[PDB]
Amino acid sequence: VKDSLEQLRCHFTWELSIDDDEMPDLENRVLDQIEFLDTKYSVGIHNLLAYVKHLKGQNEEALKSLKEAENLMQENVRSLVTWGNFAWMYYHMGRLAEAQTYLDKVENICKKLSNPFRYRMECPEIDCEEGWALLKCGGKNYERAKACFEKVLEVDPENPESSAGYAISAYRLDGFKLATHKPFSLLPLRQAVRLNPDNGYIKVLLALKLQDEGQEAEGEKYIEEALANMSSQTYVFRYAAKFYRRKGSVDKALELLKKAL
């Protein structure tokens, strides 16, 4: 049984790095900033929350998060992660019959093309899923997250999902670096914005990077488009506030912060 579980590709086997000091605020931090609104991304969030809840000693709550992920899909290789997490959670809760049932579901979907493996499968969807999980867990995971999306992009250079993941990963990693420039700095965000034209989050990142390279006027256009569609709250306001602060538009910056609260 344990041999089977270790072969799964899911939050329980991805060695997500979360140090103790991050623990107390992680769940809120994850929920406060939903970068995309499509259902597959929301399923990813519920899976990550289940894992985090388990680590906080909250197995009952962890299971409920997995059932929420299950229910959303109820309305494809992208169920493998949720099922793998169920198998682990039921194993932990001492419900082995149910764990076996979920292992069976996985094995079934992995019953190859010629996928060599019994319980895992190489595919860009799961590489993307691993990347999004790493991205949500904070800094120590960012290089791995970037590498995950890179792996997808190598084979599918125009993939909307991994272009965005790579771009956000590169941006966050860029932040850690000592400031000032590098050629094609704007390239990954531009590509991500073109491939994901309905995402305001990546537009604000692009706007901030543009502003940083003395292209504040072009940057402001992207800020405005983002804000025009942000029915998708809420962390977008924080980044937009920073843009206007740097510009010198204090009234706008302040209203955006009040909205972020």
Side-chain angles (χ1 to χ4, degrees), residues 1-2 4-32 34-111 114-261:
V1 179
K2 197 63 178 284
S4 290
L5 295 172
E6 299 293 349
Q7 202 188 339
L8 297 166
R9 302 186 68 179
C10 65
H11 295 73
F12 288 87
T13 61
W14 284 329
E15 294 172 23
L16 302 177
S17 201
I18 306 171
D19 37 51
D20 300 309
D21 279 24
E22 215 301 299
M23 253 322 143
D25 200 88
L26 186 42
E27 174 180 344
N28 278 329
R29 171 159 82 63
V30 163
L31 288 177
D32 194 283
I34 54 114
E35 293 93 349
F36 306 82
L37 274 71
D38 60 54
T39 60
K40 66 167 176 49
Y41 195 77
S42 171
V43 172
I45 293 168
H46 286 302
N47 275 297
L48 174 59
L49 293 176
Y51 174 72
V52 165
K53 283 168 177 171
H54 168 65
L55 296 181
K56 292 199 286 190
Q58 291 171 3
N59 281 352
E60 296 75 11
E61 299 306 307
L63 185 57
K64 293 171 184 174
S65 281
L66 291 183
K67 285 292 198 180
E68 284 191 283
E70 197 176 46
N71 174 85
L72 283 184
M73 299 192 297
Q74 264 171 42
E75 302 179 286
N76 64 323
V77 77
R78 266 192 223 264
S79 3
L80 274 179
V81 173
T82 300
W83 295 343
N85 291 335
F86 267 114
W88 273 92
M89 285 300 307
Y90 287 133
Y91 161 72
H92 286 314
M93 299 166 95
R95 290 157 70 166
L96 294 173
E98 285 162 284
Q100 184 59 51
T101 294
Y102 282 88
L103 282 173
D104 291 354
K105 287 184 180 194
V106 168
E107 166 170 40
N108 174 259
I109 252 108
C110 295
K111 260 201 227 258
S114 193
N115 169 27
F117 320 108
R118 186 180 179 198
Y119 287 118
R120 70 188 290 276
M121 199 168 33
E122 237 57 33
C123 77
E125 288 80 11
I126 305 309
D127 290 334
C128 279
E129 288 291 314
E130 182 183 351
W132 295 118
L134 297 161
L135 252 200
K136 300 287 306 193
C137 288
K140 310 177 300 309
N141 303 282
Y142 289 167
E143 299 282 4
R144 280 185 61 195
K146 180 178 159 186
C148 283
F149 298 112
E150 273 190 88
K151 177 185 173 189
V152 178
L153 285 171
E154 188 137 1
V155 175
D156 187 14
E158 286 283 285
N159 177 248
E161 181 177 5
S162 62
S163 178
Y166 179 84
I168 297 160
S169 290
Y171 182 87
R172 298 194 183 165
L173 280 160
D174 280 342
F176 295 167
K177 294 166 181 175
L178 180 64
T180 317
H181 204 271
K182 185 71 199 273
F184 310 111
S185 271
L186 307 175
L187 188 63
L189 283 165
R190 290 205 193 277
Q191 308 314 265
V193 163
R194 186 178 77 254
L195 295 173
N196 302 268
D198 290 346
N199 186 276
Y201 182 63
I202 59 177
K203 287 198 224 292
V204 187
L205 292 192
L206 170 57
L208 284 168
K209 187 107 175 137
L210 280 172
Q211 177 173 59
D212 192 28
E213 320 218 1
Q215 294 191 57
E216 184 176 78
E218 185 187 8
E220 191 169 353
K221 291 181 188 176
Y222 283 110
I223 292 290
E224 291 207 305
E225 292 179 15
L227 296 176
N229 287 257
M230 287 297 82
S231 43
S232 60
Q233 329 109 349
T234 176
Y235 212 88
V236 270
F237 295 131
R238 212 188 285 224
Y239 286 107
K242 185 164 154 288
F243 181 93
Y244 287 109
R245 179 48 162 169
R246 301 175 151 187
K247 188 201 186 179
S249 300
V250 298
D251 290 323
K252 286 183 181 179
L254 200 99
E255 288 299 313
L256 292 176
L257 290 174
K258 293 179 178 158
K259 283 182 200 169
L261 282 165

